[PDB]
Scaffold this active site. Structure first.
Site, short mmCIF file in Angstrom:
data_model
loop_
_atom_site.label_atom_id
_atom_site.label_comp_id
_atom_site.label_asym_id
_atom_site.label_seq_id
_atom_site.Cartn_x
_atom_site.Cartn_y
_atom_site.Cartn_z
N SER A 61 -5.18 -7.92 -7.16
CA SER A 61 -6.24 -7.55 -6.22
C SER A 61 -7.57 -7.53 -6.90
O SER A 61 -7.66 -7.51 -8.17
CB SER A 61 -5.94 -6.19 -5.55
OG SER A 61 -6.00 -5.09 -6.46
N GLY B 144 -7.49 -6.76 -10.97
CA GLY B 144 -6.28 -6.92 -11.76
C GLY B 144 -5.54 -8.16 -11.29
O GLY B 144 -6.09 -8.98 -10.50
N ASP C 38 4.18 2.46 -12.16
CA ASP C 38 3.10 1.89 -12.87
C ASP C 38 2.07 2.95 -13.27
O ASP C 38 0.83 2.74 -13.18
CB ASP C 38 2.46 0.77 -12.02
CG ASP C 38 1.62 -0.16 -12.84
OD1 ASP C 38 1.76 -0.24 -14.11
OD2 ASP C 38 0.78 -0.86 -12.21
C1 LIG Z 1 -6.08 -3.33 -10.71
N1 LIG Z 1 -7.11 -2.44 -11.23
C2 LIG Z 1 -8.27 -2.16 -10.61
O1 LIG Z 1 -8.57 -2.65 -9.53
C3 LIG Z 1 -9.19 -1.19 -11.37
S1 LIG Z 1 -10.78 -0.76 -10.70
C4 LIG Z 1 -10.49 0.38 -9.42
N2 LIG Z 1 -9.45 0.12 -8.63
C5 LIG Z 1 -9.45 1.13 -7.75
C6 LIG Z 1 -8.61 1.40 -6.69
BR1 LIG Z 1 -7.17 0.20 -6.32
C7 LIG Z 1 -8.83 2.53 -5.92
BR2 LIG Z 1 -7.63 2.82 -4.48
C8 LIG Z 1 -9.87 3.44 -6.17
BR3 LIG Z 1 -10.06 4.98 -5.05
C9 LIG Z 1 -10.75 3.20 -7.24
BR4 LIG Z 1 -12.17 4.41 -7.58
C10 LIG Z 1 -10.52 1.98 -8.07
N3 LIG Z 1 -11.19 1.49 -9.15
C11 LIG Z 1 -12.38 2.01 -9.87
#
Ligand SMILES: CNC(=O)CSc1nc2c(Br)c(Br)c(Br)c(Br)c2n1C
Length: 326
Positions: free
Chosen positions: A45, A42, A150
């Site tokens: 990060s 995103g 959020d």
């Molecule tokens: C900004 N959006 C993303 O990074 C979407 S993808 C994604 N981010 C994650 C995070 Br942070 C955590 Br904590 C965990 Br546990 C899982 Br599983 C995640 N997945 C699949």
């Protein structure tokens, strides 16, 4: 404006609980965790499935894009404070690349299925069930003095095999202080509350309930996102054209808010449009009286009228979910 529940949580707790700027990060060992594959990304990060090399247990590695220390400590402090709570993602370690100082947050692994693909497979019962699980998390964070700010499907990780849910990404989260005034540029657009779109800054936990109602309307009506506006002004118009402008005008005058000539201009004048108008054949198996009554109780302009997370969990809608649990 003050919260109707959990207003005094951070007032009774010692300063160290909420004084996140006084946290000193105890950095773990970068080498313990190896990146296995990218899983997401995103604005702030990149996110990877990983391995703990010590014990060979899966993990999630969140590599942070360049961020102010104030703001990473806020996310870290909130994570530590909620670690162990119902359906809250578990922070396991915090590590930094020695050369560049780029921080990585390490979490429990959740084998997620992306919502765009998961949510159209959900039966009427799973929707109930997963919305209940997500309500446990919001009640818990609210009872601990925290607003997530959020809530959206992208932030709700679901292992649909283990019937397991975690609320993730506490990067926009904030402690609640009665009558303190907050940045309104939080949430993501489709999920921002009226409070945000009209500059009401002394908001509270109730903001996550609007966002949950958007997510839920998206799910039962099979229309993601539910309020589909292009920029912020367009976001309030999209709401107005469902909830009507009469209810907006009463909201506006209760909290003594003037709505900016051009915004006022954009919103115009609108009838309320009954929830039943969103019913169609694709969505009909999900839009019962109890679903509507519950939705109607979340999507209220007035943040003070919305159900609290604890109330929502009791609504007759989730009666079969409670009974399975009891
Ligand atoms: C900004 N959006 C993303 O990074 C979407 S993808 C994604 N981010 C994650 C995070 Br942070 C955590 Br904590 C965990 Br546990 C899982 Br599983 C995640 N997945 C699949």
């Amino acid at each position: 404006s003050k919260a109707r529940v959990y207003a005094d949580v951070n007032v009774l707790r010692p300063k160290e609980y909420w004084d996140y700027e006084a946290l000193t990060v105890q950095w773990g060992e970068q080498d313990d965790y190896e990146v296995v594959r990218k899983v997401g990304r995103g604005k702030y990060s990149e996110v990877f499935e990983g391995i703990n090399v010590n014990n060979n247990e899966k993990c999630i590695i969140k590599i942070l894009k360049p961020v102010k220390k104030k703001k990473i400590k806020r996310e870290i402090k909130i994570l530590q404070n909620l670690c162990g709570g119902p359906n809250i993602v578990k922070l396991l370690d915090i590590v930094r690349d020695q050369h560049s100082k780029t921080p990585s947050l390490i979490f429990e692994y959740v084998n997620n299925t992306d919502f765009k693909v998961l949510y159209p497979t959900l039966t009427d019962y799973d929707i109930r069930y997963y919305i209940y699980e997500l309500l446990k998390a919001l009640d818990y964070c609210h009872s601990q003095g925290i607003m997530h700010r959020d809530v959206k499907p992208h932030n709700v990780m679901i292992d649909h095999e283990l019937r397991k849910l975690r609320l993730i990404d506490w990067g926009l989260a904030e402690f609640y202080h009665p009558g303190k005034e907050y940045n309104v540029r939080v949430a993501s657009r489709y999920f921002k509350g009226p409070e945000l779109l009209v500059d009401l800054q002394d908001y509270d936990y109730s903001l996550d309930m609007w966002s949950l109602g958007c997510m839920f309307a998206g799910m039962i009506f099979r229309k993601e996102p539910f309020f589909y506006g292009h920029d912020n002004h367009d976001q309030l118009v999209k709401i107005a054209k469902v909830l009507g402008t009469d209810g907006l005008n009463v909201y506006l005058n209760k909290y003594r808010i003037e709505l900016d000539p051009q915004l006022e201009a954009l919103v115009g004048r609108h009838s309320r449009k009954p929830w039943l108008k969103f019913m169609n054949a694709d969505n009909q198996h999900l839009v019962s009286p109890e679903a509507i009554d519950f939705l109607d109780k979340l999507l209220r302009y007035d943040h003070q009228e919305r159900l609290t997370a604890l109330e929502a969990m009791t609504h007759p809608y989730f009666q079969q979910v409670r009974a399975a649990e009891n």
